[PDB]
Amino acid sequence: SFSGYLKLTDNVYIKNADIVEEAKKVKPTVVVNAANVYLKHGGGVAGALNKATNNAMQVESDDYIATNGPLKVGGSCVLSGHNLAKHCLHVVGPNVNKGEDIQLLKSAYENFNQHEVLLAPLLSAGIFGADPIHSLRVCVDTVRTNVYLAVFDKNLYDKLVSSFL
Ligand SMILES: CC(=O)c1ccc(OCC(=O)O)cc1
Numbered sequence: 001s002f003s004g005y006l007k008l009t010d011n012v013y014i015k016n017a018d019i020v021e022e023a024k025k026v027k028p029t030v031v032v033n034a035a036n037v038y039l040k041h042g043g044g045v046a047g048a049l050n051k052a053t054n055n056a057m058q059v060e061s062d063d064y065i066a067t068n069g070p071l072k073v074g075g076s077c078v079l080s081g082h083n084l085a086k087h088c089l090h091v092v093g094p095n096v097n098k099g100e101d102i103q104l105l106k107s108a109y110e111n112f113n114q115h116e117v118l119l120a121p122l123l124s125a126g127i128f129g130a131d132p133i134h135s136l137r138v139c140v141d142t143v144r145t146n147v148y149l150a151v152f153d154k155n156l157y158d159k160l161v162s163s164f165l
Helices: 019-026 044-052 056-068 102-114 132-142 154-163
Strands: 012-016 030-035 076-080 087-092 117-120 146-151
Touching: 012 132, 012 154, 019 044, 019 117, 019 146, 030 044, 044 056, 056 076, 087 102, 102 132, 132 146, 132 154, 146 154
Parallel strands: 012 146, 030 087, 030 117, 117 146
Antiparallel strands: 076 087
16 A cells, blocks of 8 residues: 655645556555556656556557547546456646646646546656646646656655745
8 A cells, every 4th residue: 555655735745756556565455557648658757657567558548549649738547457457547737848738737637537446656756847846736726536656756755845935
């Protein structure tokens, strides 16, 4: 079960951890992927989760895209969690480095509300280019279900906890 998390609010918890390693340990009902609209799991959280599934997540995702077309920025889809979780909720946060609308971060987090408990990264953080402090603020103000945030970077984790309002 979820261990070593710091409680931020009634429903938001945070831990300095590799989300892939957290997923293998807990095998949560839902692990959130920091997806793009094409479900191309190239780098960041997506690349790491996909690599831990031995590329099964990418093969499954390519079949999903062939059938359904791309996701919307702010949107999501539920696919298999493979060896990591029961399900993977692929959530598309805005990628500021791709010139996408940061104002869509709240819509992206609203997807978490369809799941009672989730293991997740901070949306639009890392290679998506948004301010992770702002992403945690939107998470806390949008997500009402139990979210266990895994922040990979130790210095970022400390900065997020120490600056949390
Ligand atoms: C050994 C094992 O149980 C295993 C499970 C899943 C693996 O990749 C993900 C998938 O195939 O969907 C690889 C290995």
